[PDB]
Design an enzyme around this catalytic site. Structure first.
Site, PDB file in Angstrom:
ATOM      1  N   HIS A   1     -21.189  31.609  11.363  1.00  0.00           N
ATOM      2  CA  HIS A   1     -21.172  32.900  11.308  1.00  0.00           C
ATOM      3  C   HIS A   1     -21.477  33.454  12.949  1.00  0.00           C
ATOM      4  O   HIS A   1     -20.716  34.416  13.105  1.00  0.00           O
ATOM      5  CB  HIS A   1     -22.603  33.378  10.457  1.00  0.00           C
TER       6      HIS A   1
ATOM      7  N   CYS B   1     -16.790  21.966  58.538  1.00  0.00           N
ATOM      8  CA  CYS B   1     -17.355  21.072  57.218  1.00  0.00           C
ATOM      9  C   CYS B   1     -18.612  20.758  57.111  1.00  0.00           C
ATOM     10  O   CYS B   1     -19.286  20.469  58.144  1.00  0.00           O
ATOM     11  CB  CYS B   1     -16.388  19.956  56.907  1.00  0.00           C
TER      12      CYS B   1
END
Length: 725
Positions: A372, A685
């Site tokens: 439902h 990085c």
């Protein structure tokens, strides 16, 4: 009017024959000339179903029962459902429907020259998964008619009665599609999607495959072979298979000689031969991916497609095609709110539709897909948490993820001055980051592919014959589906790297060649004998020195063969190659000589070559190193460790680790300036720019061209930097 042939159906006939049959006619009528092979047959119509159901007059008896019945009283519903289904089973076909089926059946056996043909009888509703209902290898007229009776009765399967009461509705019909069987019982079959289901990434085709009839892969009764194919390069005619995952393929559905009703097919174990093979060939994966695209081009949307390889013909058929659209439960979408607004409860009636409106999420103890509450949340949504009433507390303060195991924590684009790129290692996550806003992958790492997809030292593969019965046996196991030990290594690197490059294509993907320390190569299977213990691994046999060492050049050659294929054959030209740990100018020179030996050169097929700038020598001879390369990516981790003489994993000293130590900054400056005066790429990085916003600031001020961040730090840093500009 009761029976219609597929070749006379189109997608505009959906109210008459349902979406499945209409789609079958749409492909037969429009795409067979574009190469798509779909088996023939016929559909019954919605008015056939109404005429059948009018009998004496069953239709109104059903309607009476369904009237007075609580679908959320699970007894009554099972009792009434069974009752209805027995009425349909015990209702005869009208005389005109029987005659018309018979005449259509007779034409099928006439089209099949002879013949004792078999058919599938499938359900095509005017409306899932399916629970649906289907019958395979049904060999004669009376069998077909009785299999149709069952399909008709399936409309009033209990969950279907609920599903309809839940979607809020009577009083319905369906169509039976009767299609010729393809002989994939002795071949292979599966399901294709024209997007990645997981991520939603639409530049890829997904193909799943196993042995036997495809009902098993559709239902998840088998773990199949899984393949990804890249759409752009497939359209250009280049090799486009990015990823191959072997399925365990335990069982397969085959025909019986012994077909009472639904006993016409059975499951049988797959032999161990076939199990550790791939069930279809590269040529087949590719051929299917082409069919997928011509189907998707035609419908103009993402498609979910069933296919089969006929073990008699050899030929590939498309069988069906349709559109594709802490605490834990069943899961797209994230959400937020206070737990009551995130609603936490057992399961919803329809009476839970007002107070459902008075809220902003739903998490339930019970339920599956067609639950439902799971439907209200589609029109979201974590269902199937045994005990969230328990786990979750009435206070707050939670946020409910679906980026499909549906978690629940425990928590809660403008112009950028630099390019914000991603740092990515895991190709199994690549398509989930295609979506993130970035400028590409500024560091695609190789070490998850080697550790986790390959798992074996390349010298063990190279020298397979010198092992080790016990080891020869382990390697062969692992390399199943690949032509040789060395081919396994090259192929898997190509897959991993093509996948990462495909994810952000056509955007830059800078691939770092393997940055393993010897202790990491030692942990691979067969590795210790090639990798003696070092006192200081950080400073040992790794990087360029390893690539160009006579002792390891055939392994480097292997990784080069993979990258070259990815660019030069697969057409993934957005890949740049980064080289780590280049200690001296002699090493830089040796590496470009090694690459060149292995067919990789700056300028050839546009190749770009980046150095990881991570040693202090790279900074103080920045200009001199830079002549060998198109730019730098700065590895601030290693730069910081070597400038300051620290292992940041040692807790005894590592408090002094700081990428923004003035000494490290002098080094970054040297590198970034050197690059700028040559108009050359300079990236950085590490999480430093994310973790220390002023470091980001300093870097933009220095003229960094890009920053490479873990995907989950990307939006925050982008926004911080954009707001600063």
């Amino acid at each position: 009017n009761y029976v219609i042939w597929f070749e006379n159906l189109r997608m505009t006939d959906v109210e008459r024959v349902g979406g499945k049959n209409a789609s079958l006619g749409e492909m037969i009528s429009q795409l067979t000339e574009k190469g798509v092979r779909v088996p023939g047959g016929f559909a019954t119509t919605a008015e056939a179903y109404r005429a059948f159901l009018a009998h004496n007059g069953l239709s109104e008896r059903i309607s009476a029962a369904l009237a007075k019945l609580d679908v959320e009283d699970v007894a009554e519903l099972a009792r009434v459902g069974k009752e209805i289904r027995q009425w349909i089973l015990d209702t005869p076909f009208p005389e005109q429907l029987d005659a018309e089926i018979e005449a259509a059946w007779n034409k099928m056996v006439a089209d099949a020259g002879g013949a004792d043909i078999s058919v599938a009888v499938r359900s095509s509703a005017t409306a899932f998964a399916g629970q649906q209902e289907t019958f395979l290898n049904i060999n004669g007229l009376d069998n077909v008619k009785e299999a149709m009776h069952h399909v008709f009765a399936s409309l009033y399967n209990d969950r279907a009665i609920s599903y309809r009461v839940h979607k809020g509705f009577d009083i319905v019909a369906l169509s039976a599609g009767v299609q010729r069987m393809v002989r994939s019982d002795s071949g292979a079959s599966g399901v294709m999607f024209t997007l990645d289901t997981e991520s939603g990434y639409d530049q890829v085709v997904f193909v799943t495959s196993s042995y036997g009839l495809g009902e098993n892969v559709v239902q998840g009764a088998v773990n199949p072979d899984e393949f990804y194919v890249f759409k752009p390069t497939l359209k250009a005619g280049k090799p486009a298979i990015l990823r191959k995952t072997m399925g365990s393929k335990h069982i397969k559905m085959i025909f019986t000689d012994k077909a009472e009703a639904g006993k016409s097919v059975t499951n049988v174990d797959v032999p161990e031969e076939d199990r550790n093979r791939f069930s279809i060939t590269d040529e087949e994966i590719t051929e299917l991916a082409h069919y997928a695209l011509t189907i998707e081009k035609h419908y103009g949307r993402p498609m979910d497609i069933e296919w089969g390889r006929d073990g008699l013909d050899g030929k590939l058929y498309i069988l069906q095609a349709r559109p594709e659209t802490l605490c834990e439960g069943r899961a797209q979408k994230v959400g937020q709110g206070k737990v009551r607004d995130v609603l936490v409860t057992d399961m919803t009636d329809p009476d839970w539709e007002p107070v459902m409106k008075r809220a902003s999420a739903i998490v339930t103890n019970r339920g599956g897909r067609t639950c439902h509450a799971a439907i209200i949340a589609r029109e979201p949504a974590v269902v199937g948490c045994g005990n969230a009433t328990e786990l979750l507390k009435n206070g707050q303060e939670v946020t409910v993820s679906c980026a499909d195991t549906g978690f629940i924590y425990a928590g809660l684009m403008p112009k950028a001055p630099v390019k914000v790129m991603m740092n990515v290692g895991n190709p199994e996550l690549a398509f989930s980051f295609a979506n993130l806003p970035s400028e590409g992958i500024g560091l695609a790492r190789m070490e998850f592919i080697i550790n986790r997809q390959i798992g074996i030292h390349p010298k063990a593969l190279l020298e397979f014959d010198k092992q080790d019965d016990e080891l020869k046996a382990e390697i062969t196991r692992r390399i199943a589906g690949y032509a040789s030990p060395v081919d396994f290594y090259v192929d898997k690197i190509a897959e991993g790297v093509a996948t990462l490059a495909a994810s952000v294509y056509p955007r830059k993907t800078i691939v770092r060649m393997s940055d393993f320390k010897s202790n990491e190569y030692a942990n691979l299977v067969g590795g210790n004998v090639y990798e003696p213990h070092e006192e200081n691994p950080m400073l040992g046999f790794r990087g360029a020195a390893r690539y160009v060492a006579d002792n390891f050049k055939d392994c480097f050659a292997l990784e080069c063969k993979a990258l070259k294929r990815v660019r030069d054959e697969m057409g993934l030209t957005n890949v740049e190659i980064m080289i780590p740990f280049v200690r001296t100018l002699g090493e830089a020179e040796a590496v470009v000589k090694a690459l060149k030996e292995n067919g990789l050169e700056r300028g050839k097929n546009g190749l770009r070559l980046i150095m990881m700038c991570e040693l202090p020598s790279n900074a103080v001879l920045a200009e001199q190193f830079l002549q060998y390369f198109d730019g730098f990516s700065i590895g601030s981790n290693d730069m910081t460790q070597l400038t300051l003489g620290l292992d940041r994993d040692s807790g005894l000293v590592s408090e002094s680790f700081d990428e923004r130590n003035p000494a490290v900054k002098v080094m970054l400056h040297l590198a970034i300036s050197a690059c700028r005066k040559q108009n050359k790429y300079v990236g950085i990085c590490g999480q430093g720019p994310s973790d220390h916003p002023d470091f980001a600031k300093w870097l933009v001020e220095e003229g960094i061209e890009s920053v490479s961040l873990n995907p989950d730090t990307v939006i925050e840093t982008w926004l911080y930097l954009a707001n600063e500009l």
